[PDB]
Design a protein around this ligand. Structure first.
Ligand SMILES: NC(=O)c1ccc[n+]([C@@H]2O[C@H](COP(=O)([O-])OP(=O)(O)OC[C@H]3O[C@@H](n4cnc5c(N)ncnc54)[C@H](O)[C@@H]3O)[C@@H](O)[C@H]2O)c1
Ligand SMILES: NC(=O)c1ccc[n+]([C@@H]2O[C@H](COP(=O)([O-])OP(=O)(O)OC[C@H]3O[C@@H](n4cnc5c(N)ncnc54)[C@H](O)[C@@H]3O)[C@@H](O)[C@H]2O)c1
Ligand SMILES: NC(=O)c1ccc[n+]([C@@H]2O[C@H](COP(=O)([O-])OP(=O)(O)OC[C@H]3O[C@@H](n4cnc5c(N)ncnc54)[C@H](O)[C@@H]3O)[C@@H](O)[C@H]2O)c1
Ligand SMILES: NC(=O)c1ccc[n+]([C@@H]2O[C@H](COP(=O)([O-])OP(=O)(O)OC[C@H]3O[C@@H](n4cnc5c(N)ncnc54)[C@H](O)[C@@H]3O)[C@@H](O)[C@H]2O)c1
Lengths: 332, 332, 332, 332
């Protein structure tokens, strides 16, 4: 399937790298009115977090050429003006962070795209997490959401725990890497006051809908989870901390066994499992959605436990966007 | 009361600063074999986290002289060799991190101190937290512990919540600033592997007895709390995230009211309360043990809630060590 | 003199703090379309770098009230629309970063301001550095620049060295704290590619005209200095490293004596002098423009030397903005 | 050649990595009293800065097994007690930081090593920089030093500049990543007070002999260079900023031409050249000694110029240790 990327940012660029690394997906067009062609060569080639691109990137005849694949470059603020159909882009990855509703994301369809994958939670577009509910996708859905990074970490874990022991209720904290929405020094941040405080100086509480959204991809958990976030001074890699009450008793060793088993079978590549003494950097460019840290979590008793799972918020999620597109392509 | 300080580190220096600032106790001696007298002047005068000392500090005639008051300086590796009595030190603050059992800390009694306050949890010394169980201290107790920074944050909050609504069970995460036990780049850390990894690069999970320890100071909560820590790349100020189930139902606004009332009355100066859109730097040099962050926390329902409280791990704790000594002196 | 502030950012806010320590200057109005009145209370009260404001600040009757003084609040994007005159603002601090020419900064004169102080270098407005050429100001100048932070650090040191020994030529590096122009993670930066790279991850080279500008305020040095910058991951406080060739020979101890003398005499409060083993955080909230670090520098020979001077780029600069206005007011 | 590593730290472990890429070098023994066998598996497998080891590592029958090769593990504090000869180690890399003199490093010969390569400057052991004076090595030298990371950056550049234009005199600053000698929070650093101050909080000036040491490896530059350092809050990658006066005039474009020619021929793989808008992270795990940054430097005139060159202080250096051993082995 031929793909367009709208917003060539952290997500858009790393989706682009994921497509090339793999390849039942072919990137054929990119729109970003804030990054011109020669600037795109530079932004793609060099990455502070994930290293230099391994391959060739060059501007040739007005196109962005990556490992010899020519890509059509647009510069449009309004998605309805991008000529996706002319460029052959069938699916568009909407990774700007400003077109997340059905109405706004649907502008791509006016440019000749057939489907849109919103790289963020959406107020109304249906949400999918690979490994949890992606089989619920069907051919009639032209606009879909791949949820958030944090939902993609929590939901595969919550699926396994709920399937085996039953989650009565749970409360989640994510300790999350800084993102582009933050500020280098104390400055204005509209209505999200805390988010405007200097990113590398602070632990910053933030709200997040990611735990409540698990109740949408796992409908039995509707109303049974919520949570909040702390942003902290690292440039990538995040961690979930799920505190839950279970219906059936589970010794921590039984939790470990069921999770490990899930990592080796049905959720292989989505949900990882470790007993090693890891820290966040050990998940740098890790492609899993969620990796359970057996050593880090703790039980109070057989029904009340705190479970820890790591996620490379940029790189795992960008790989999942690609995997969702491959899955949608298989149901055409 | 006349006080000696063993280990002139973050805690020993800030305890000294606290003492001089308030006049509540008199620092008359300091022992640190790794910091000679002229170096002590420099380490006291300049502080990256808390600013330059606002007062005078000089070396004169072999003495550290702070605001014109002379302090006897020792340089002994073995605490049994420190001549407290010669200096007139009555209480010793054991702030080295290496003498935390009653057997080890009791060495200070051989050179003439009368009582010892260990600036850390102790496997066997009686544990006190100001505002929670300090009234259980009595004159028979020559060696005591002021718990950990984390315990002094969680315990006042748990006291108020338990007294009003009943904590059935709870699980705590603390997101905690870097400390001296950590490493600048990946290096050896003995038994605690994860703590050797580069501190400013990583989110580092860690075990902590701080939640379990609340049960030592609030015996009704024995067996009912536990938790863990993440170390993150900030130089000071930490936060507790307490997920708990309550016996009697409590709307989040009732929780707020009850905590606010506590902070204004019997736990004033120990337990603070805010509704402001704060971040960690807002607690830089804050003397509270625990400041409840109303806006940051979230309830799932009337019996299951996540409560957030901030603590200056260096400066709140150091002030508590001074406060505990004042209380002990009042009982002689 | 009654003052307005256009751009209530790191410098706007700190200039406002500094003005409340003077009362040769009274802040009577602030404009910032991105910070509404109640948001201003918050942004002013809490400061990650320089701590909580130690006076009073509240919103009353649509005004910002600081230490009991009511301040008119504007919300205009176009400075020609700001009604300074109505609010009584005789001088306006232009601290937005986007109105740095005489043409653009003169828009304030339309709304009734009498003079404008641009908190940055200007292509065409006369530039002044306190202690170096501020006496060349006269009361016919309606638009003036206070130069950059870096020029305020270099120029006083260069003045002393040139006066005593003669600078034949110099090349300067500044190792500079992160600023609001930088990005939390790799993102777009228009024509300044390097500045888009993640700020907390990187040492970032940058061009700067600050050394060349010293030739505007010390005309004998025109054409004799230039330099560049590295941005590094600290939130505030910067350092100049001046490599210069001297006309007359100077042993490093003669340089120290002459700089020390200048710091005690005519440039007191502007140029500081230390022999202590300082680091950047020892200059946190330091009001000097430049503090020579005697220990840090190094001579190759009597005609070729590297001199080191620290500056709190936010706080020292903001104090100079106030000091310039005080000087300007004394000429009215 | 069979090699042992004393001090399995940042350098020892990355030399070990680089050796496993060589084929002319085989690691056969490692000594580190502070890292036991099972801990060495962990410390080698995971690396915060350079990523997970791309190979296999396990403990088997008391040996460390890397890529199928068994390595004897010692736990000795005194290097004269290590049985190098028995384990087959002909050369020892001395990478502890504490045995840098001929007399101290020479202890390894008592245990049966044949040659010692000190991973640091030595007061008396002959010093080699690959590409600059390595051909001055002969089989009579049983103890050698591979200099410092900084000298390996400056010396290749200085060779090219001096060869084409003549360096009359120069002064160097290096803006250097944190290293293991620094401290996470303000703490004791006996001799070197500035180095004890919190590493992630501060720009820290430091003395360095690295520029003076270029005159050992390039004797025509003896007495013509010196400099200093600033340690800044990044975990790896550093930059040299050389300010020099040239004998023959050199337009900046001619400097660029000569450095580029050198990078392409005789110093290929040692001295790199870029015109791209690079920042420090672009050199993460870059194996060059020195990469000239053409965009970053600046000339005042044809005889006085500031040249900028990057270096991964951990990874380029570690590769140079291996390249020096390969050269030495070639002459045996
Ligand atoms: N970074 C993460 O960890 C992460 C993880 C999962 C999902 N997300 C989501 O993905 C989205 C993008 O986040 P990001 O971190 O990559 O942000 P980003 O700021 O790095 O990238 C956003 C990009 O969109 C471009 N852009 C802005 N307006 C545009 C327009 N009108 N048309 C086309 N392009 C435009 C920008 O120039 C920028 O390059 C957001 O919805 C975010 O919440 C981010
Ligand atoms: N930093 C915090 O946030 C914090 C908070 C609460 C409690 N504590 C506890 O207080 C203690 C000190 O912690 P810190 O952060 O100040 O550590 P630190 O490393 O800054 O200070 C420890 C000091 O002890 C000194 N020392 C070591 N061996 C000694 C000996 N034999 N005799 C005398 N002095 C000796 C060191 O030279 C150093 O100056 C530890 O038990 C720690 O757990 C720390
Ligand atoms: N931060 C420093 O170290 C420093 C030092 C010396 C001088 N400077 C200079 O001072 C200026 C401000 O720098 P800063 O660091 O305070 O930046 P900043 O981004 O913190 O502040 C800029 C402020 O201007 C406001 N603004 C933007 N457009 C505006 C408009 N049209 N009208 C009114 N306000 C508007 C923004 O909302 C913001 O609050 C720049 O010229 C900068 O180069 C900064
Ligand atoms: N990190 C760099 O950027 C870099 C670059 C060039 C050279 N160097 C030099 O290389 C050396 C090592 O530096 P590093 O950064 O790897 O330091 P490091 O602290 O990571 O490693 C030193 C190792 O030596 C071990 N050790 C200590 N005492 C020992 C003993 N008696 N015997 C055996 N092992 C012992 C330690 O346990 C540690 O694992 C130093 O001389 C340093 O100056 C470092």
């Amino acid at each position: 399937v031929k793909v367009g990327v709208n917003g060539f940012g952290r997500i858009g660029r790393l989706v682009t790298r994921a497509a090339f690394n793999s390849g039942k997906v072919d990137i054929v067009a990119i729109n970003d009115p804030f990054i011109d062609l020669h600037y795109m060569v530079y932004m793609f080639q060099y990455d502070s977090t994930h290293g230099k691109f391994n391959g060739t990137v060059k501007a040739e005849n007005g196109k962005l050429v990556i490992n010899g694949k020519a890509i059509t470059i647009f510069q449009e603020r309004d998605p309805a003006n991008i000529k996706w159909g002319d460029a052959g882009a069938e699916y568009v990855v909407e990774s700007t962070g400003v077109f997340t509703t059905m109405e706004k994301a649907g502008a791509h369809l006016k440019g000749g795209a057939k489907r849109v994958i919103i790289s963020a939670p959406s107020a109304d577009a249906p949400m999918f997490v690979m490994g949890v509910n992606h089989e619920k996708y069907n051919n009639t859905l032209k606009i879909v959401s791949n949820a958030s990074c944090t939902t993609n970490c929590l939901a595969p874990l919550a699926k396994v725990i709920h399937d085996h022991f039953g989650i009565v209720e749970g409360l989640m904290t994510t300790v999350h890497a800084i993102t582009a929405t933050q500020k280098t020094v104390d400055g204005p941040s509209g209505k999200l006051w805390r988010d405007g405080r200097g990113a590398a100086q602070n632990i910053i509480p933030a709200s997040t809908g990611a735990a409540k959204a698990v109740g949408k991809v796992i409908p039995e958990l509707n109303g049974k989870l919520t949570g909040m976030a702390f942003r902290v001074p690292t440039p990538n890699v995040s961690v979930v901390d799920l505190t839950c009450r279970l219906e059936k008793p589970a010794k921590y060793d039984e939790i470990k066994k069921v999770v490990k088993q899930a990592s080796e079978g049905p959720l292989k590549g989505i949900l990882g499992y470790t007993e090693d003494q890891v820290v966040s950097c050990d998940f740098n460019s890790d492609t899993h959605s969620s990796t359970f840290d057996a050593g880090a979590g703790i039980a109070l008793n057989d029904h009340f436990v705190k479970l820890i799972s790591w996620y490379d918020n940029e790189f795992g999620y960008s790989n999942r966007v690609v995997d969702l597109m491959v899955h949608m392509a298989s149901k055409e």
